Paper text:
Several proteins from plant pathogenesis-related family 10 (PR10) are highly abundant in the latex of opium poppy and have recently been shown to play diverse and important roles in the biosynthesis of benzylisoquinoline alkaloids (BIAs). PR10-10 has been proposed to act as a noncatalytic BIA binding protein. We observed that an intermolecular disulfide bond between Cys59 and Cys155 is formed in the apo structure, while the binding of alkaloid compounds to the central hydrophobic pocket induces conformational changes that prevent the formation of this intermolecular disulfide bond.
Author numbering:
A (entry chain A), B (entry chain A): 8 to 34, 37 to 114, 117 to 157
Write the structure that this text describes.
């Protein structure tokens, strides 16, 4: 089982398009972290994404990652493509996809971690899944109606 | 974020229908556990599922659960419906759905935990997700071609 996907899906009381625009322009200050990096444009001058080098602390351990982020407004989807860092000691591929859709009924938010392990001895990224989950729960608790 | 779903999805080198029949009739002896219970029939005499009371040790702690299992051969789906036990101290609802499908390309196996927390102070079931993940990885490593 070398190729796989972990998912955490949450219901949020908020319109999908609004919530996506919030997620797209926001990060969890309690968590030690910062980034440096650049904005990417499509060629008309308006940002289409970013490339960031993160310095962060996960389960007590300091780590780095380089991620390229792209977005698709029409499907309310953010994609983080990790190319380098501590995660690449365990994974050949590590992508994080964030989707927001309206309930058939507010909204449903889906974090997916699409991964390929280096070898069988690599863990699956349950530590990252819980991290992203708690971060989006925290951000969702500071948003409210009206 | 009280209602949600956790998913672990794995690729396995095995035909989907065969793998489903394996999963359907198998349990991880390393893990302390046993069950008692009964078989359920649809009314023609052939088993359609089971109702089991599990005694198991999760992350060092002894727990119990009562689960009703049903299956759908045509969609290769097993459904475990938990009605009682330690998990119900955290969740109003706790269902585990196991699906096996062929790759568009072997197979893709999907464990989903569909949950509703009692309150905001309840955890999401990352401990169960990792447990089910490692159990299906273990079972998949003992299966091989030909």
């Amino acid at each position: 089982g070398l190729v796989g996907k972990l998912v955490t899906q949450l219901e949020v009381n908020c319109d999908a398009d609004i919530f996506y625009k919030i997620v797209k322009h926001h990060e969890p200050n309690v968590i030690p972290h910062f980034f440096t990096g650049v904005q990417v444009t499509k060629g008309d001058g308006l940002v289409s994404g970013c490339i960031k080098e993160w310095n962060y602390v996960l389960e007590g351990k300091a780590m780095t990652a380089v991620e390229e982020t792209t977005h698709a407004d029409e499907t309310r989807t953010l994609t983080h493509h990790i190319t380098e860092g501590d995660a690449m000691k365990d994974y050949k591929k590590f992508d994080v996809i964030v989707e927001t859709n309206p309930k058939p009924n507010g909204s449903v938010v889906t974090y997916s971690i699409v991964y390929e392990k280096i070898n069988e001895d690599s863990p699956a990224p349950f530590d990252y899944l819980k991290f992203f989950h708690q971060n989006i729960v925290d951000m969702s608790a500071h948003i409210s109606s009206s």
